Amino acid sequence: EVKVEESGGGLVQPGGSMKLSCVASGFTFSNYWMEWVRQSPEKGLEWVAEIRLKSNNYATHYAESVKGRFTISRDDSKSSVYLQMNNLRAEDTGIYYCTRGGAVGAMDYWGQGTSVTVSSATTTAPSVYPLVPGCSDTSGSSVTLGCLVKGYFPEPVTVKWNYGALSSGVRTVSSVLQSGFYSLSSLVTVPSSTWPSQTVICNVAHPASKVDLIKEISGP
Amino acid sequence: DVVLTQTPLSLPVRLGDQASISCRSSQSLLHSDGNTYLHWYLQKPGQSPKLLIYKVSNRFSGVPDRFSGSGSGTDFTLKISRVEAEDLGVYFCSQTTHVPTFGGGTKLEIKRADAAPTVSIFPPSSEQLTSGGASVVCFLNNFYPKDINVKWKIDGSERQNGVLNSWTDQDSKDSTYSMSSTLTLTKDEYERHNSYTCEATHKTSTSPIVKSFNR
């Protein structure tokens, strides 16, 4: 059961630095090359850096675009690989994925990625407003509740319900950027006989501000 | 660097039918050792991309034979037979014969029977007023196809400005879409009106699904 999880993402001003971390499990870490690949809406997926084995004296290789600014390293004892990013530029914005260089000849296992944003703008934690069934007659799949997330930067924000215990019927629209801020809504549909009886809460996470906003929708 | 061009960009496919995704490289991917390191991946919404096929035609761990890869010179093809709801997502190719590069991806869409949206409307929360704005939200849930129109009427008059329309990714279970139309007015602008109505017009009917409330 191979597992790969990255972290350290966030917002950084141009010319700043930040170090990304990746921890793996489910395999002998030291026997594999590790890679960092990034994804941006303008270049798609792009290989960034690679680090090989101890027997290779931990040889590293970098994409020409990050040469001299990024440094990849690993700590086999902690099954982790790192990416030190310096002299960051707007073009470095993207989702950074940590991947295992597989024995089959392809990067075989990937993490979910950690987002990095290089911008002159500043971080702004999201404001969250309740979306409450607005006094009406029951004519639309028991009851649909939600949370409106606005005024945040950078992206992303992830939204869970009841800490992730409520996943069925969850609908989260993509974020949209306007007036310098992102916004989105997440809604969930549940049986009308279970609300308010059963607590419904949305968990809004915003990595850039290191926050998790927990809010319980009630039916006033 | 090797350029991998994938086509189509978007690929609508009926359940049970076959989908063919192509990947064309700017140079031969045949390594001197006789192997061709061309691979295929699937990335579902928010999930980590997963390896499907490695070295042109080998299926990776847990991958069914429904997924098949082939190649001829600089052209490679991924074929997904008996497509199922859970197959939605972005498929992309990559090569590791030369410095690693990736294709732009192909978004596989599941073509299902048309479905009319369920509409819900939400007045702004008093909690948002001190921000200076007030957002009225109209949620259209579980419909297909994706295209749909939302008309807002304030006190009977159509209002087009101040509206943001955004969709969810296709649902992996029922293959439907959902979307929200958010009308954001200034706090005072919102208070200068009573009736807020949203009208959703979808392919499924010539008559709009209407929802509204009075402040």
Partner: peptide, 8 residues
Amino acid sequence: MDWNMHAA
């Protein structure tokens, strides 16, 4: 050079 463990 080689860019994957299999070729390596």
